[PDB]
Amino acid sequence: GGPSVFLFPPKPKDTLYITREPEVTCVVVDVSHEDPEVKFNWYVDGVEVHNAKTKPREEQYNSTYRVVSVLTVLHQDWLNGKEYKCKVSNKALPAPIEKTISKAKGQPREPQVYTLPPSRDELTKNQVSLTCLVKGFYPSDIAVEWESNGQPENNYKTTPPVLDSDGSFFLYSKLTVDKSRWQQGNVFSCSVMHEALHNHYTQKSLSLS
Amino acid sequence: GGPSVFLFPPKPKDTLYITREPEVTCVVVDVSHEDPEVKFNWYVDGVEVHNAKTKPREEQYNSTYRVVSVLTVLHQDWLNGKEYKCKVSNKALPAPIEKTISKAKGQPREPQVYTLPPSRDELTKNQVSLTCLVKGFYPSDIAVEWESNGQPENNYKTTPPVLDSDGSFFLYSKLTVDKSRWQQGNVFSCSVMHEALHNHYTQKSLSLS
Ligand SMILES: *C1O[C@H](CO[C@H]2O[C@@H](C)[C@@H](O)[C@@H](O)[C@@H]2O)[C@@H](O[C@@H]2O[C@H](CO)[C@@H](O[C@@H]3O[C@H](CO[C@H]4O[C@H](CO)[C@@H](O)[C@H](O)[C@@H]4O[C@@H]4O[C@H](CO)[C@@H](O)[C@H](O)[C@H]4NC(C)=O)[C@@H](O)[C@H](O[C@H]4O[C@H](CO)[C@@H](O)[C@H](O)[C@@H]4O[C@@H]4O[C@H](CO)[C@@H](O)[C@H](O)[C@H]4NC(C)=O)[C@@H]3O)[C@H](O)[C@H]2NC(C)=O)[C@H](O)[C@H]1NC(C)=O
Ligand SMILES: *[C@@H]1O[C@H](CO[C@H]2O[C@@H](C)[C@@H](O)[C@@H](O)[C@@H]2O)[C@@H](O[C@@H]2O[C@H](CO)[C@@H](O[C@@H]3O[C@H](CO[C@H]4O[C@H](CO)[C@@H](O)[C@H](O)[C@@H]4O[C@@H]4O[C@H](CO)[C@@H](O)[C@H](O)[C@H]4NC(C)=O)[C@@H](O)[C@H](O[C@H]4O[C@H](CO)[C@@H](O)[C@H](O)[C@@H]4O[C@@H]4O[C@H](CO)[C@@H](O)[C@H](O)[C@H]4NC(C)=O)[C@@H]3O)[C@H](O)[C@H]2NC(C)=O)[C@H](O)[C@H]1NC(C)=O
């Protein structure tokens, strides 16, 4: 009936490098037409901070508006698991709605990255699958990417993290390339970005034998 | 605002074998403690059916009833894409609630199935990963299982299906085995069940080269 809040974490990549600007994000939907005024409050471990940046209002094709507030956060505060609260206010609610979010708790575990060449079966096609396996990792927050000769590779998909029997995580990422490119010996690389890696980064390479 | 409905599909495995019994399950929750009486109507392609089988009272701990109706479906009807609709009637609600479920539309596409041995770099550990790449398949309904010397294998996990770039789906399945088992030359088998496979079934195997 009333407005509903939704609280998102920052991207895996953004928390792992000073280069990047990680953010938590409070999205309110079903903001009433008659009362449009939404007030956001942000707290780190209960202690209020103030740098949230409320953004305009995106009117939705169902009568209601959508108000998004973005809190910037320090890399190490998220990595150290500090707790982030969004309190949202509006006259279409009797009480203010709150949401709290934080990194998954627990000893981080270093991912193990193994690359696997195409199956002999598959070498009968005009495209081949280069596979990257990332297992053993915790928390589930990770980024994976591909490249050749310094250049980002376009055509890959990566599975979501899957919970493994030992409570750690794994995924597979698939890069699709022209068989010729594989046949001609070009070197392809799997880039994995996780908290528990040295410099939050590792890169594993694969090429024709 | 009172009761809510959820409509779950049959299990992929269940629709592909006469041997199995696929069902569609309508679940109504949050039922007014005052008035306990929910009335189910079922429809197959608009046309009412009556072989539905409704159960009694699963009042979960909250002070509200849960009622489950199960419609037994014919294997061919599901694969032909027949629509199943659950109407839940109640004096609390003004209009009765409707939910519909079916097999995703599109032209079905045959999965290619490829087994990938453990990376050279993994073989230093005591447990190793046998990988099964299933790709090129539509719709996303599929099942994957492992076995060796005719016996279901214990320790695998399968990623959810992932929408690939050509609108087909792919997944990977990982079977973990002790290194020895792999080194003794044991054959291991990925088995995939999908509507677009011949006899709804293919098996692809894997051993030490
Ligand atoms: C009293 O409690 C009730 C439940 O018992 C609770 O007891 C307490 C003590 C505690 O133990 C709790 O943990 C217990 O849950 C409350 O009822 C619950 O209500 C919530 C929602 O408020 C229901 O949530 C839905 O759940 C489904 C998934 O349900 C499966 O898994 C559940 C466990 O994870 C299980 O409980 C269910 O039984 C069910 O199991 C399946 O059962 C079928 C048939 O029996 C089997 O064939 C399956 O194998 C089996 N699955 C397996 C395995 O578990 C979830 O999918 C629903 O999500 C949809 O809806 C959301 C909105 O409601 C939406 O946000 C989601 O995106 C999603 O919507 C759909 O998403 C896809 C996208 O592709 C599309 O299908 C649609 O586009 C989209 N549809 C839309 C728009 O809706 C949903 O979250 C919960 O299941 C239910 N519990 C039971 C039991 O049924 C009750 O509210 C409470 N009372 C009060 C007053 O508070
Ligand atoms: C009027 O329009 C509104 C918006 O526009 C609509 O336009 C129409 C034309 C059509 O296009 C629609 O499809 C559009 O939605 C509607 O608003 C919607 O309201 C619903 C709630 O009813 C929202 O549903 C929730 O979605 C979140 C996930 O949101 C992300 O993913 C969406 C795609 O799947 C995406 O569209 C969203 O924008 C959002 O994207 C993310 O954004 C962040 C921040 O910017 C980015 O940084 C991310 O990268 C980006 N993600 C990417 C990438 O996809 C989902 O999480 C919610 O599920 C939770 O809550 C359910 C009930 O509230 C519950 O049933 C679920 O089980 C689930 O509950 C949580 O489960 C997690 C699991 O781990 C736990 O962590 C929690 O414990 C648990 N939480 C609790 C307490 O329940 C939910 O599905 C929808 O997002 C929103 N649309 C957008 C967009 O904002 C409005 O409904 C519509 N009215 C109608 C009906 O006409």
Q: Based on the domain organization, do B200 and B153 belong to the same domain?
A: yes
Is residue B139 reached through a cis peptide bond, with omega within 30 degrees of 0 on the bond before it? yes
How many domains are there within chain A?
2
Q: How many CA atoms lie within 13 A of B77 on its CB side?
A: 17
In terms of domains, do A71 and A144 share one?
no
Residue that terminates a domain, selected from A69, A102, A135? A102
Indicate which technique resolved this structure. Answer: X-ray
Closest by Cα among A83, A88, A84, A73 to A28: A88
Does A109 share its domain with A168? yes
Instruction: Measure the CA–CA gap between A129 and B134, rounded to whole angstroms.
Output: 11
Instruction: Test B118 with A119 for CB contact under 8 angstroms.
Output: no
Identify whether the C-beta of residue B196 lies closer than 8 Å to the C-beta of residue B141: no
Largest CA distance in chain A: 67
Q: Tell which residue, B108, B51, B49, B50, has the closest CA to residue B79.
A: B108
Alpha-carbon span A167 to A44, nearest angstrom: 28
Query: A89 with A122, same domain?
Result: no
Answer whether A196's CB lies under 8 Å from A146's CB.
Answer: no
In whole angstroms, give the CA distance from residue B70 to residue B17.
Answer: 19
* Beta-strand relationship, A169-178 and A156-158: antiparallel
> Longest Cα pair distance anywhere in chain B, in angstroms?
68
Domain carrying residue A176? 103-208
Which residues from chain B sit within 8 angstroms of residue A163, using beta carbons?
157
Q: Which of A83, A102, A121 is the last residue of a domain?
A: A102
With beta carbons under 8 A apart, name residues in chain A contacting B171. 159
The Cα of A52 is separated from the nearest Cα of chain B by a number of Å equal to 33
Tell me: do B111 and B204 sit in the same domain: yes
B167 Ramachandran zone, left/alpha/beta (phi>0; psi -120 to 50): left
Distance, CA of A87 to CA of A47 (rounded, Å): 13
Six-digit token string for B31: 């039922």
Q: Name the residue type at position A198.
A: H
Strand partners, A179: none
Examine the domain organization and report whether B59 and B144 are in the same domain. Answer: no
B194 and B107 in a common domain? yes
- Whether B29 and B94 map to the same domain: the answer is yes
Together in a domain, B92 and B141: no
Q: How far is CA B176 from CA A133, A160, B131, B136, B171, in A?
A: 13, 19, 9, 24, 17
A203/A109 same-domain check: yes
For ligand 1, atom 42: residue with the closest CA: B8
Residue A147: how many other CB atoms lie within 10 Å: 17
| Inter-chain touch B119–A122, beta carbons under 8 Å | no
Task: Tell me the one-letter amino acid at B163.
Answer: L
Q: Which of B58, B81, B102 is the last residue of a domain?
A: B102
Strand partners, A88: A40, A97
Kindly state whether residues A70 and A135 are assigned to the same domain. Answer: no
Q: How far is CA A35 from CA A7, A57, A94, B151, in A?
A: 22, 13, 13, 64
Q: Are residues B79 and B111 in the same domain?
A: no
- Bridge partners of B70, per DSSP, are B25, B53
CATH number for B197? 2.60.40.10
Neighbours of B13 (CB within 10 A): 17
